[model samples]
Target: MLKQVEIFTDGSCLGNPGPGGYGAILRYRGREKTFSAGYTRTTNNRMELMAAIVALEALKEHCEVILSTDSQYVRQGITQWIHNWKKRGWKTADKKPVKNVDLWQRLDAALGQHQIKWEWVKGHAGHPENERCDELARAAAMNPTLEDTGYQVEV
Candidate 1:
């Protein structure tokens, strides 16, 4: 259990490309911490990526971390799709740049020093942490007052 921690994260959106928020929970040695924030205009997927990015950034030091989320986009992007994207110059196949490159790169930097094991959980089916995170995120989304710096419309 050397420098071990567990994290659960979630995101919410009022509209797919509208107001959004991200929430996260971190537990280490039975102590828990939570944080969340809102965005003026963004996508749910961006919020999801933000959740994990913020959680990883919150760690004070490198850890053997178990990062769980209710998003396959987050889990799969980090664990699976990223490699190919990076290889292809951060493009989604057919030469289109991958969406959220800013957050994805930030996420890459955020976890660079830690060993993270990704976990995906079903949302809204009574998983305590995910439910709590969902609540945290949704509340922020409904009361948002901040800008999403790099967010842009797909055209």
Candidate 2:
């Protein structure tokens, strides 16, 4: 039988392209671990995706994961849109190149490592784990800077 893990994730940005960060909490067998990281310049969506990517990457072995996040982009992209995007050679249905392709690809690689069930939670609705994650993200964004080397936005 596979081990089961539950994760809650959140991200925050000071501005659209400002200081940003991601936070995640992983719970397994009643124990929990938390993660947070900051970026000098990034977007909330990127941070959101990065939170899940980081959490999934932290696992040492394959497990069943229940991943909860407030971002529809994160949940829907993985659960729904990714199939069509991959089928189209990474382009959207409109034939436009996908945004955050790098993170999306990274996320795709991470997904292959585990069986994940994506869940969407309402942001700021007083959920404990989500609120804690939000706090982590906001605190990281307010503090020191780390280079978001993977962040690339087409002008």
Candidate 3:
């Protein structure tokens, strides 16, 4: 049997394609660990995916993961649309190329390594874990230092 882990994630950005960050909290048994990182240029959606990606990739061994996020895009993309997206060579049903392929592929790598249960929570309505996640993300976004190597300007 695999260890069961719980995770909460959130992301923040000052501008749509500006300084951003992601925060994640991992809990197992009575112990907890936290992670947050800032990016020089990124998007809120990317950071949200990054939150879960960072947390999942940090695990040393395969485990059952319950990841909670406030972003529907992450949950829906991974849980529902990913299979078709991959089968269609990363294009959406309308034959349009998918956005954020870099982060999505990175996230897919993390997904294959563990069993994950995704949950989308209502954001900014006073949820404790989400609030703390928001705090971490906001602080990182405010003082971003690292470059977002994968970020691209769409247009």
- The digit string of per-residue lDDT tens for model 3 on 59-88 reads 888878889888888877876889897899
lDDT, candidate 1, 1-155, per-residue tens? 33588888899988978999988888875778897888998888999889898888978877789887889798678668988976888876687777788888898987789998877777567569888899899989988889998787861
Reference-based TM-score of each model = 0.90, 0.90, 0.89
Q: What pairs collide in candidate 2? A: none
Go through the candidates in order and give the C-alpha RMSD of each one to the true structure.
2.0, 2.2, 2.4
Worst 10 residues of 2 by lDDT: 118-127
TM-score of 2: 0.90
- What stretches of model 1 exceed 4 Å from their correct place? 1-3, 92-95
Off by over 4 Å in 2: 1-3, 93-96
Total clashing pairs for each candidate: 0, 0, 0
Question: Residues 1-155, candidate 2, lDDT per residue (tens digit)?
Answer: 22598899999988988999898899864778899988998899999999989899888978799888899888778668888887898986777778888899998988987998877887567569888899999999988469887777572
Model 1 whole-model lDDT (C-alpha atoms): 0.84
Q: How far out, in Å, is residue 141 in model 2?
A: 0.6
